[PDB]
Amino acid sequence: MIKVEIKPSQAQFTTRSGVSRQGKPYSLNEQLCYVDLGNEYPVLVKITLDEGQPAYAPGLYTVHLSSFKVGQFGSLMIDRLRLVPA
Amino acid sequence: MIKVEIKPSQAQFTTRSGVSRQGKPYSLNEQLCYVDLGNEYPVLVKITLDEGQPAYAPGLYTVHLSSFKVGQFGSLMIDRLRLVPA
């Protein structure tokens, strides 16, 4: 299991916006977190949230299976990092 | 944890080869596996092995932390799916 932590300072999201190729508006909410990749300290990672989802509260989390998909060359990829409480 | 299975029919690798932009030879070994993504059946996934590593034997495996890296846009990505026995 991957250990992910939302620190107290990372409890909010920011929103970027724009317009798709054929005219539709979009909004993307982004939140920061720390992921332990086994180096001397955890590293900073950006998360893009799913539609209608609030910012994750501060705490410890692991990665849900729905984060992964098979990509166009047949290898596994991350779609969006989706978290669940540890 | 992600459940990965190497079936008896997937016990071998194949090798693709070529030449880099500035002349160096390369060889890549590829193996197939099944990954359970929570659908009605596991899905077929291609693995590219690391240099000097044999094909994984048939059996159950999970994904090692070294499979992941932070990408150039600051989000988590899979580098290569690296497995360890379950």
PDB file of C-alpha atoms in Angstrom:
ATOM      1  CA  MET A   1       0.000   0.000   0.000  1.00  0.00           C
ATOM      2  CA  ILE A   2       0.926   3.534  -0.885  1.00  0.00           C
ATOM      3  CA  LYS A   3       0.840   5.907   2.133  1.00  0.00           C
ATOM      4  CA  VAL A   4      -0.576   9.374   1.205  1.00  0.00           C
ATOM      5  CA  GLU A   5      -0.909  12.223   3.692  1.00  0.00           C
ATOM      6  CA  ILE A   6      -2.955  15.448   3.456  1.00  0.00           C
ATOM      7  CA  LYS A   7      -1.173  17.888   5.865  1.00  0.00           C
ATOM      8  CA  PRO A   8      -3.186  20.617   7.747  1.00  0.00           C
ATOM      9  CA  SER A   9      -1.813  23.177   5.268  1.00  0.00           C
ATOM     10  CA  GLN A  10      -3.219  21.209   2.297  1.00  0.00           C
ATOM     11  CA  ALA A  11      -6.875  21.154   3.352  1.00  0.00           C
ATOM     12  CA  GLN A  12      -8.135  23.330   0.487  1.00  0.00           C
ATOM     13  CA  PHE A  13      -8.320  23.026  -3.291  1.00  0.00           C
ATOM     14  CA  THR A  14      -7.813  25.581  -6.046  1.00  0.00           C
ATOM     15  CA  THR A  15      -9.797  25.636  -9.296  1.00  0.00           C
ATOM     16  CA  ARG A  16      -8.607  26.098 -12.861  1.00  0.00           C
ATOM     17  CA  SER A  17     -11.062  26.776 -15.665  1.00  0.00           C
ATOM     18  CA  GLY A  18     -11.337  27.039 -19.437  1.00  0.00           C
ATOM     19  CA  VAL A  19     -13.231  25.996 -22.555  1.00  0.00           C
ATOM     20  CA  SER A  20     -12.996  22.689 -24.490  1.00  0.00           C
ATOM     21  CA  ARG A  21     -12.223  22.384 -28.222  1.00  0.00           C
ATOM     22  CA  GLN A  22     -15.873  22.525 -29.221  1.00  0.00           C
ATOM     23  CA  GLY A  23     -17.104  25.169 -26.774  1.00  0.00           C
ATOM     24  CA  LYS A  24     -18.033  23.438 -23.445  1.00  0.00           C
ATOM     25  CA  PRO A  25     -16.900  25.066 -20.106  1.00  0.00           C
ATOM     26  CA  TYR A  26     -14.848  22.984 -17.672  1.00  0.00           C
ATOM     27  CA  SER A  27     -13.576  23.347 -14.148  1.00  0.00           C
ATOM     28  CA  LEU A  28     -10.866  21.288 -12.509  1.00  0.00           C
ATOM     29  CA  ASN A  29     -10.245  21.220  -8.715  1.00  0.00           C
ATOM     30  CA  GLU A  30      -6.661  20.507  -7.595  1.00  0.00           C
ATOM     31  CA  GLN A  31      -5.302  19.584  -4.157  1.00  0.00           C
ATOM     32  CA  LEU A  32      -1.739  18.910  -2.905  1.00  0.00           C
ATOM     33  CA  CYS A  33      -0.580  15.931  -0.840  1.00  0.00           C
ATOM     34  CA  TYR A  34       2.500  14.059   0.284  1.00  0.00           C
ATOM     35  CA  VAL A  35       3.235  10.544  -0.990  1.00  0.00           C
ATOM     36  CA  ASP A  36       5.812   8.280   0.546  1.00  0.00           C
ATOM     37  CA  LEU A  37       7.903   6.771  -2.232  1.00  0.00           C
ATOM     38  CA  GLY A  38      10.480   5.345   0.162  1.00  0.00           C
ATOM     39  CA  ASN A  39      13.050   8.185  -0.155  1.00  0.00           C
ATOM     40  CA  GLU A  40      14.360  10.081   2.938  1.00  0.00           C
ATOM     41  CA  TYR A  41      11.189  12.266   2.991  1.00  0.00           C
ATOM     42  CA  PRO A  42       7.692  12.028   1.318  1.00  0.00           C
ATOM     43  CA  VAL A  43       7.328  13.977  -1.947  1.00  0.00           C
ATOM     44  CA  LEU A  44       4.782  16.620  -2.992  1.00  0.00           C
ATOM     45  CA  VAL A  45       2.121  15.395  -5.503  1.00  0.00           C
ATOM     46  CA  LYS A  46      -0.767  17.221  -7.207  1.00  0.00           C
ATOM     47  CA  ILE A  47      -4.224  15.538  -7.166  1.00  0.00           C
ATOM     48  CA  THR A  48      -7.060  16.504  -9.568  1.00  0.00           C
ATOM     49  CA  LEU A  49     -10.354  15.741  -7.832  1.00  0.00           C
ATOM     50  CA  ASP A  50     -13.411  14.156  -9.479  1.00  0.00           C
ATOM     51  CA  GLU A  51     -16.562  16.183 -10.269  1.00  0.00           C
ATOM     52  CA  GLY A  52     -18.687  17.098  -7.220  1.00  0.00           C
ATOM     53  CA  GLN A  53     -16.092  15.838  -4.732  1.00  0.00           C
ATOM     54  CA  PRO A  54     -14.924  17.995  -1.743  1.00  0.00           C
ATOM     55  CA  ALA A  55     -11.261  18.396  -0.780  1.00  0.00           C
ATOM     56  CA  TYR A  56      -9.965  15.442   1.263  1.00  0.00           C
ATOM     57  CA  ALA A  57      -9.675  16.377   4.953  1.00  0.00           C
ATOM     58  CA  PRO A  58      -6.176  16.266   6.680  1.00  0.00           C
ATOM     59  CA  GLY A  59      -5.157  12.702   7.536  1.00  0.00           C
ATOM     60  CA  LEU A  60      -3.710   9.422   6.299  1.00  0.00           C
ATOM     61  CA  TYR A  61      -5.004   7.744   3.153  1.00  0.00           C
ATOM     62  CA  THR A  62      -4.194   4.961   0.729  1.00  0.00           C
ATOM     63  CA  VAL A  63      -4.907   4.681  -3.061  1.00  0.00           C
ATOM     64  CA  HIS A  64      -8.229   3.182  -4.320  1.00  0.00           C
ATOM     65  CA  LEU A  65      -8.193   0.591  -7.139  1.00  0.00           C
ATOM     66  CA  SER A  66     -10.299   2.924  -9.339  1.00  0.00           C
ATOM     67  CA  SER A  67      -7.164   5.111  -9.741  1.00  0.00           C
ATOM     68  CA  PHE A  68      -5.835   2.687 -12.395  1.00  0.00           C
ATOM     69  CA  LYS A  69      -6.725   1.885 -16.036  1.00  0.00           C
ATOM     70  CA  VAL A  70      -5.103   0.115 -18.978  1.00  0.00           C
ATOM     71  CA  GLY A  71      -3.597   2.724 -21.333  1.00  0.00           C
ATOM     72  CA  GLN A  72      -3.534   2.869 -25.089  1.00  0.00           C
ATOM     73  CA  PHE A  73      -0.265   0.861 -25.364  1.00  0.00           C
ATOM     74  CA  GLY A  74      -1.614  -2.015 -23.136  1.00  0.00           C
ATOM     75  CA  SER A  75       0.396  -1.074 -19.972  1.00  0.00           C
ATOM     76  CA  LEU A  76      -1.123  -0.015 -16.630  1.00  0.00           C
ATOM     77  CA  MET A  77      -1.433   3.720 -15.993  1.00  0.00           C
ATOM     78  CA  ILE A  78      -2.799   6.053 -13.315  1.00  0.00           C
ATOM     79  CA  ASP A  79      -5.996   7.765 -14.454  1.00  0.00           C
ATOM     80  CA  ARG A  80      -6.521  10.038 -11.385  1.00  0.00           C
ATOM     81  CA  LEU A  81      -5.222   9.382  -7.875  1.00  0.00           C
ATOM     82  CA  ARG A  82      -8.395   8.482  -5.945  1.00  0.00           C
ATOM     83  CA  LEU A  83      -7.988   8.107  -2.174  1.00  0.00           C
ATOM     84  CA  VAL A  84      -9.662   6.229   0.662  1.00  0.00           C
ATOM     85  CA  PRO A  85      -9.052   6.596   4.457  1.00  0.00           C
ATOM     86  CA  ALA A  86      -6.311   4.386   5.872  1.00  0.00           C
TER      87      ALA A  86
ATOM     88  CA  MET B   1      -3.177  -3.737  -2.795  1.00  0.00           C
ATOM     89  CA  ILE B   2      -3.341  -4.509  -6.470  1.00  0.00           C
ATOM     90  CA  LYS B   3      -3.638  -8.266  -7.202  1.00  0.00           C
ATOM     91  CA  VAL B   4      -1.552  -9.308 -10.277  1.00  0.00           C
ATOM     92  CA  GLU B   5      -1.416 -12.867 -11.593  1.00  0.00           C
ATOM     93  CA  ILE B   6       1.073 -14.486 -14.006  1.00  0.00           C
ATOM     94  CA  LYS B   7      -0.860 -17.477 -15.508  1.00  0.00           C
ATOM     95  CA  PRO B   8       1.017 -20.696 -16.579  1.00  0.00           C
ATOM     96  CA  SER B   9       0.665 -19.557 -20.207  1.00  0.00           C
ATOM     97  CA  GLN B  10       2.441 -16.247 -19.449  1.00  0.00           C
ATOM     98  CA  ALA B  11       5.689 -17.669 -18.068  1.00  0.00           C
ATOM     99  CA  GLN B  12       7.902 -16.394 -20.900  1.00  0.00           C
ATOM    100  CA  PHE B  13       8.940 -12.995 -22.230  1.00  0.00           C
ATOM    101  CA  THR B  14       9.484 -11.739 -25.765  1.00  0.00           C
ATOM    102  CA  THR B  15      12.175  -9.230 -26.748  1.00  0.00           C
ATOM    103  CA  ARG B  16      11.954  -6.180 -28.980  1.00  0.00           C
ATOM    104  CA  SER B  17      15.080  -4.422 -30.198  1.00  0.00           C
ATOM    105  CA  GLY B  18      16.286  -1.310 -31.996  1.00  0.00           C
ATOM    106  CA  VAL B  19      18.700   1.618 -31.989  1.00  0.00           C
ATOM    107  CA  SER B  20      18.457   4.899 -30.012  1.00  0.00           C
ATOM    108  CA  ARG B  21      18.565   8.399 -31.551  1.00  0.00           C
ATOM    109  CA  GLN B  22      22.330   8.670 -31.233  1.00  0.00           C
ATOM    110  CA  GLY B  23      23.309   5.112 -32.173  1.00  0.00           C
ATOM    111  CA  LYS B  24      23.152   2.906 -29.003  1.00  0.00           C
ATOM    112  CA  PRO B  25      21.501  -0.601 -29.240  1.00  0.00           C
ATOM    113  CA  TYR B  26      18.645  -1.431 -26.868  1.00  0.00           C
ATOM    114  CA  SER B  27      16.633  -4.479 -25.959  1.00  0.00           C
ATOM    115  CA  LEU B  28      13.340  -4.534 -24.108  1.00  0.00           C
ATOM    116  CA  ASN B  29      11.825  -7.708 -22.553  1.00  0.00           C
ATOM    117  CA  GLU B  30       8.013  -7.822 -22.306  1.00  0.00           C
ATOM    118  CA  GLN B  31       5.750 -10.174 -20.338  1.00  0.00           C
ATOM    119  CA  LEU B  32       1.932 -10.425 -20.063  1.00  0.00           C
ATOM    120  CA  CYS B  33      -0.108 -10.639 -16.858  1.00  0.00           C
ATOM    121  CA  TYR B  34      -3.605 -10.281 -15.482  1.00  0.00           C
ATOM    122  CA  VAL B  35      -4.516  -7.403 -13.158  1.00  0.00           C
ATOM    123  CA  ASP B  36      -7.686  -7.291 -11.142  1.00  0.00           C
ATOM    124  CA  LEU B  37      -9.247  -3.859 -11.537  1.00  0.00           C
ATOM    125  CA  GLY B  38     -12.501  -4.889  -9.877  1.00  0.00           C
ATOM    126  CA  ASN B  39     -14.480  -5.586 -13.098  1.00  0.00           C
ATOM    127  CA  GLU B  40     -16.203  -8.981 -13.717  1.00  0.00           C
ATOM    128  CA  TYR B  41     -12.855 -10.522 -14.832  1.00  0.00           C
ATOM    129  CA  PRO B  42      -9.131  -9.463 -14.513  1.00  0.00           C
ATOM    130  CA  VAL B  43      -7.717  -7.604 -17.536  1.00  0.00           C
ATOM    131  CA  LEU B  44      -4.639  -8.318 -19.674  1.00  0.00           C
ATOM    132  CA  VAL B  45      -1.661  -5.943 -19.062  1.00  0.00           C
ATOM    133  CA  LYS B  46       1.785  -5.747 -20.695  1.00  0.00           C
ATOM    134  CA  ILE B  47       4.849  -5.487 -18.388  1.00  0.00           C
ATOM    135  CA  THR B  48       8.287  -4.270 -19.589  1.00  0.00           C
ATOM    136  CA  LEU B  49      10.923  -5.894 -17.385  1.00  0.00           C
ATOM    137  CA  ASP B  50      14.023  -4.156 -15.990  1.00  0.00           C
ATOM    138  CA  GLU B  51      17.530  -4.887 -17.338  1.00  0.00           C
ATOM    139  CA  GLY B  52      18.973  -8.278 -16.301  1.00  0.00           C
ATOM    140  CA  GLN B  53      15.703  -9.466 -14.750  1.00  0.00           C
ATOM    141  CA  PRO B  54      14.178 -12.914 -15.606  1.00  0.00           C
ATOM    142  CA  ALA B  55      10.489 -13.409 -16.415  1.00  0.00           C
ATOM    143  CA  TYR B  56       8.327 -13.597 -13.273  1.00  0.00           C
ATOM    144  CA  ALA B  57       7.301 -17.202 -12.554  1.00  0.00           C
ATOM    145  CA  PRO B  58       3.512 -18.142 -12.547  1.00  0.00           C
ATOM    146  CA  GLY B  59       1.811 -17.049  -9.324  1.00  0.00           C
ATOM    147  CA  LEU B  60       0.243 -14.211  -7.358  1.00  0.00           C
ATOM    148  CA  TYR B  61       1.995 -10.870  -6.955  1.00  0.00           C
ATOM    149  CA  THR B  62       1.394  -7.329  -5.783  1.00  0.00           C
ATOM    150  CA  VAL B  63       2.946  -4.008  -7.013  1.00  0.00           C
ATOM    151  CA  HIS B  64       6.219  -2.686  -5.462  1.00  0.00           C
ATOM    152  CA  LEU B  65       6.483   0.995  -4.442  1.00  0.00           C
ATOM    153  CA  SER B  66       9.371   1.495  -6.918  1.00  0.00           C
ATOM    154  CA  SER B  67       6.776   1.263  -9.743  1.00  0.00           C
ATOM    155  CA  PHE B  68       5.784   4.910  -9.108  1.00  0.00           C
ATOM    156  CA  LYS B  69       7.393   8.323  -9.777  1.00  0.00           C
ATOM    157  CA  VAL B  70       6.284  11.952  -9.904  1.00  0.00           C
ATOM    158  CA  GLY B  71       5.781  12.981 -13.553  1.00  0.00           C
ATOM    159  CA  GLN B  72       6.642  16.184 -15.322  1.00  0.00           C
ATOM    160  CA  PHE B  73       3.278  17.848 -14.480  1.00  0.00           C
ATOM    161  CA  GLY B  74       3.622  17.080 -10.693  1.00  0.00           C
ATOM    162  CA  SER B  75       1.071  14.177 -10.619  1.00  0.00           C
ATOM    163  CA  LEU B  76       1.883  10.552  -9.726  1.00  0.00           C
ATOM    164  CA  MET B  77       2.569   8.184 -12.619  1.00  0.00           C
ATOM    165  CA  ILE B  78       3.578   4.555 -13.158  1.00  0.00           C
ATOM    166  CA  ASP B  79       7.168   4.269 -14.373  1.00  0.00           C
ATOM    167  CA  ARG B  80       7.266   0.450 -14.890  1.00  0.00           C
ATOM    168  CA  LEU B  81       5.084  -2.100 -13.109  1.00  0.00           C
ATOM    169  CA  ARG B  82       7.536  -3.809 -10.730  1.00  0.00           C
ATOM    170  CA  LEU B  83       6.188  -6.849  -8.866  1.00  0.00           C
ATOM    171  CA  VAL B  84       6.844  -8.665  -5.604  1.00  0.00           C
ATOM    172  CA  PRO B  85       5.402 -12.047  -4.422  1.00  0.00           C
ATOM    173  CA  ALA B  86       2.111 -11.832  -2.546  1.00  0.00           C
TER     174      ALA B  86
END
